[PDB]
């Protein structure tokens, strides 16, 4: 289903996987998600200031400023892939990471409950490891308060 992507005024050309749009030595399945080239429209989408953990993690690992990571994303993804509706609350995904890996030459072993997944490029000059914990519910005391 590419409805939002076909209707995106910030996109141009045909729909294809990102790893086909920006070819590189990707670690399968990095970049498999569908996207379109970004045209000249400038992104309104603001920096996800309340959901920036992935940018922070990559910034700490590489010394790359978070605003630079964000600028690179805004130049290389159309708005409908940059923000599928949940960016401001759930933040970036490993789809976004694929773009950062291609531009900045990165590879990261993502550690999660069900198993590790390494994403990025086989010829990356920066390598690091990030723990991914998914959203989840936990039973707490009746009068629990943050």
Residue numbers in the entry: 9 to 154
Reported in the publication:
PRO adopts a compact, three-domain fold, although its C-terminal conformation is held in place by a neighboring copy of the enzyme. The second domain (green panel) is predominantly a well-ordered five-helix bundle (⍺3-⍺7). Helix ⍺3 contains the catalytic cysteine nucleophile (C61) with its solvent-exposed thiol group at the N-terminal end of ⍺3 (Fig. 5A (arrows) and Fig. 5B). Domain III terminates with what appears to be a flexible loop that is solvent exposed until it inserts itself into the active site of a neighboring copy of the enzyme. This loop contains the active site histidine (H144) that is ∼17 Å from the catalytic cystine. The ∼17 Å distance between the side chains of C61 and H144 does not comprise a functional active site. The asymmetric unit (ASU) is composed of two copies of MRFV PRO with most interactions occurring between the alpha helical bundles of domain II of each molecule. The C-terminal tail of each copy of protein in the ASU traverses into its neighbor and appears to complete the active site of the neighboring molecule. The catalytic C61 and incoming His144 residue of the neighboring symmetry mate arrange themselves to within a few angstroms of each other and appear coordinated for catalysis. MRFV PRO is monomeric in solution according to size-exclusion chromatography, and this dimeric interaction between the monomers of the ASU is most likely a crystallographic artifact. Interestingly, aside from the terminal proline (P142), our crystal structure of MRFV PRO reveals that the enzyme lacks a complete GPP motif.
